[PDB]
């Protein structure tokens, strides 16, 4: 189907404790494929998926230099933001940046992105037009004026419509074993006595990829949204994800309850019940 590529970056200042810490990671869909951490002894961008390992030394050298450069420009930008917000040099602050692209099943650009946040709040974002900006406040408007003057959007647009999509397509091909495979959830229902009067029914979805999933409980066909404990989808640590949904059921009433699972890896939504 559709796919995405994202590069995420975080710099965190630490006054009196040297230069900011810089960490960046790249993803295709829900798959991590590259990482860089400035605090590694002689830091390099490193592979984190098998299908990127085949890129040659020139690729890793360029990537590494780009990461080092962004760490350095982030240091300058953190200093600028202290000025823009009239802040002291004593505190730790955070600068986050994301950029990348979404493509459709045919490989065509669906959306490009480039956006920044300061201290966990929106700062400036490239709009969906890839031609104009949304500034969150009067500080970000200063950046906007500079970036309008320098025709920054046009340069980002050229990357997002060109290289971003072209390299994503390359990765999807080289990684076709995994990036183009959905792993359906393995599902089951468990029963957890609370007392002689009631028990929890917990519906599990394990080992699925990608992360998007819907899990719901029904009682005689009616959705139990308000009475369901639904945990956040969580990584298993091996590429796949987990989720569960639980409801408290009076003794003897279990056969009224069905769990429903939707995942792109499932041809049709599944219906499960507790089987003693």
């Amino acid at each position: 189907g559709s796919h995405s590529m994202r590069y995420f970056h975080t710099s965190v200042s630490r006054p009196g404790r040297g230069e900011p810490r810089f960490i960046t990671v790249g993803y295709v869909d829900d798959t991590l494929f590259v990482r860089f951490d400035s605090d590694a002894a002689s830091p390099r961008e490193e592979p984190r998926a098998p299908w990127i390992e085949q890129e040659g030394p020139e690729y890793w050298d360029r990537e590494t230099q780009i990461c080092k450069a962004k760490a350095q420009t982030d240091r300058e930008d953190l200093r600028t933001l202290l000025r823009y917000y009239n802040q002291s040099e004593a505190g730790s602050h955070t600068l986050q940046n994301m950029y990348g692209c979404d493509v459709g099943p045919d490989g065509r650009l669906l959306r490009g992105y480039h956006q920044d946040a300061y201290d966990g709040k929106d700062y400036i974002a490239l709009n969906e037009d890839l031609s104009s900006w949304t500034a969150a406040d009067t500080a970000a408007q200063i950046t906007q004026r500079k970036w309008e003057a320098a025709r920054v959007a046009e340069q980002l647009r050229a990357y997002l419509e060109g290289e971003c999509v072209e390299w994503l397509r390359r990765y999807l091909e080289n990684g076709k074993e995994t990036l183009q495979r959905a792993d359906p959830p393995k599902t089951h229902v468990t029963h957890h006595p609370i007392s002689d009067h009631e028990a929890t029914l917990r519906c599990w979805a394990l080992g699925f990829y990608p992360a998007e999933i819907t899990l719901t409980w029904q009682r005689d066909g009616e959705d139990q949204t308000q009475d369901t404990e639904l945990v956040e989808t969580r990584p298993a640590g091996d590429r796949t994800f987990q989720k569960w949904a639980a409801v408290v059921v009076p003794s003897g009433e279990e056969q009224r309850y069905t769990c429903h699972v939707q995942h792109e890896g499932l041809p049709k939504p599944l219906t499960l019940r507790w089987e003693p």
């Binding site: 590069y7 790249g26 690729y59 360029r62 990537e63 780009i66 990461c67 450069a69 962004k70 420009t73 300058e76 930008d77 600028t80 933001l81 823009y84 950029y99 920044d116 700062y123 400036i124 950046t143 500079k146 970036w147 320098a150 920054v152 340069q155 990357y159 290289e163 971003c164 390299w167």
Partner: peptide, 9 residues
């Protein structure tokens, strides 16, 4: 692959 970031806030 990444892009060089030339810009400053």
């Amino acid at each position: 692959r990444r892009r060089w970031h030339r810009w400053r806030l």
